[PDB]
Amino acid sequence: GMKSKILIFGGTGYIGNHMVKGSLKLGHPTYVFTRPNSSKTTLLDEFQSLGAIIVKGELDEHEKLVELMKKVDVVISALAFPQILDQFKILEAIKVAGNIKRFLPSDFGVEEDRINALPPFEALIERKRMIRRAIEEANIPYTYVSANCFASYFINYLLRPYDPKDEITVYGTGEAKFAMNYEQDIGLYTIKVATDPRALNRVVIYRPSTNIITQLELISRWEKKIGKKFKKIHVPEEEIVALTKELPEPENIPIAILHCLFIDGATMSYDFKENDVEASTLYPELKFTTIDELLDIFVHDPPPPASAAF
């Protein structure tokens, strides 16, 4: 009926698929832009069976983008690192169409406007800042989402649950705090805020109080859940820093991010601002899956590990 029509770029992506599913679950007409040569053929059929409208095309097709923009109300971009500046093609179409009511660029991680990182990562978040500055300059309605750490992604990365090893790697001292959220929830909440007036032209941060922890605490809780003890092996901070300067790209990017998230504790190193919105306080009918619930999921039906594109 009155439901906003949503267009999602990168909908077949790691986090994008959860936004598409969340959009459909909420009853929103959902358009998914995808490359003609995408290998996500089985996922696209799933989206279709769920009610999504699949649109094949390339970001270089300016006219196609403009005509598509005219048919929707909300635009969400879940594109990857290599395509950050390609979002200017999406922005140009939005500017020409002129009817878009909300645009969410591809952030979904740290809050780039209040934190800094080592060169490898700083370069990438500076590109994300460029997109933001352009949105504001053009007076385009927006919502900036800081989703913090993707939980399944990082529980897999830090605990390597699919590995029967007796040792576990800890980055730095392991005392740095960080927040992580279940992908399925990040996707649903993102759709919710994209139409919520309370998130119009604001930064929304996903930081439920039940999802804040340190590497050492996560390991301890996992050990209790599975009844096994691990030998902790630490990677000194000075070691991590040196690597970001010597190793080639993209190899040095994940290293810089590990420093940012697990040594500098960038997802928890700041206090909320007056205009900030913490998403968990928004909907009494919903809640983020907690860390304990996440660990239970990895015991009963663990999701496969993943690796972002650099």
Ligand X SMILES: CCOC(=O)[C@H]1C[C@@H]1c1ccc(O)c(OC)c1
Phi, psi of 130 (to 5 degrees): -60, -45
Selection from 178, 193, 241, 209 nearest residue 23 by Cα = 193
When asked if residue 30 is in the footprint of ligand X (CB under 6 A), the reply is no
- Residue closer to ligand X by CB (options 82, 98) is 82
Nearer to ligand X, 34 or 156 (CB): 156
Classify 50 as helix, strand or coil: coil
Q: How far is the CB of 308 from a copy of itself (least distance, A)?
A: 14
Contact characters 17-56, ligand NAP, x per CB under 6 A: -----------------xx--x-x----------------
Q: Which range binds ligand X by CB under 6 A, 68-76, 197-205, 217-225, 255-263?
A: 255-263
Residue 123's contacts (CB-CB under 8 Å, 6 or more residues apart) are none
Task: Say which entry of ligand X, a copy of itself, ligand NAP, none residue 4 contacts (CB below 5 to 8 A, set by partner kind).
Answer: none
Residues 6+ apart with CB under 8 A from 271: none
Active-site residue, 128 included? yes
- The entry of ligand X, ligand NAP, a copy of itself, none near residue 258 (CB within 5 to 8 angstroms by kind) is ligand X
C-alpha 17/C-alpha 47 separation (Å) is 9
In this structure, the dihedral spanned by the alpha carbons of residues 77, 115, 129 and 61, taken in order and rounded to 10 degrees, is: -30
Residue 93 and residue 87: Cα distance in Å, rounded? 10
Q: Is 15 marked as binding a ligand?
A: yes
Does 128 count as an annotated binding residue? Answer: yes
For 34-72, letters b (16+ CB in 10 Å) and e give beeeeebeebbeebeeeebeeeeeebeeeebbbebbeeb
CB-nearer residue toward a copy of itself: 244 or 289 = 244
> One of 128, 192, 229, 287 is an active-site residue; which one?
128
The reply to whether 108 sits near ligand NAP by the rule CB under 6 A is yes
Q: Find the part of the chain contacting ligand NAP (CB under 6 A) among 10-18, 61-69, 233-241, 284-292.
A: 10-18
Does 228 carry a binding-site annotation? no
Tokens 């990168």, residue located: 10
Q: Which does 248 bind (CB under 5 to 8 A by kind): ligand X, a copy of itself, ligand NAP, none?
A: a copy of itself
Distance of alpha carbon 225 from alpha carbon 113, whole angstroms: 37
Q: Judged by CB under 6 A, does residue 257 bind ligand X? A: yes
Q: What is the sign of the dihedral through the CA atoms of 7, 13, 17 and 19? A: negative
Q: Which does 116 bind (CB under 5 to 8 A by kind): ligand X, ligand NAP, a copy of itself, none?
A: none
Residues engaged in binding a copy of itself (CB under 8 A)? 39, 160, 163, 165, 168-169, 233-235, 239, 242-243, 245-249
What track of x and - describes contact with ligand X for positions 179 through 218 (by CB under 6 A)?
Answer: ----------------------------------------
> Which H or E run contains 6?
strand 6-9
* CB of 9 closer than 8 Å to CB of 15: no
Question: β-pairing, 149-150 with 277-278?
Answer: unpaired
* Contacts of residue 277, Cβ cutoff 8 Å, sequence gap at least 6: 193, 198, 199, 202, 203, 204, 205
Rule CB under 6 A: which residues touch ligand X? 109-110, 148-149, 157, 254, 257-258, 261, 267, 308
Catalytic residues: 128
Rule CB under 6 A: which residues touch ligand NAP? 10, 12-16, 34-35, 38, 40, 59, 78-81, 83, 106, 108-109, 147, 149-150, 153, 308-309
Binding-site residue positions for substrate: 110, 254
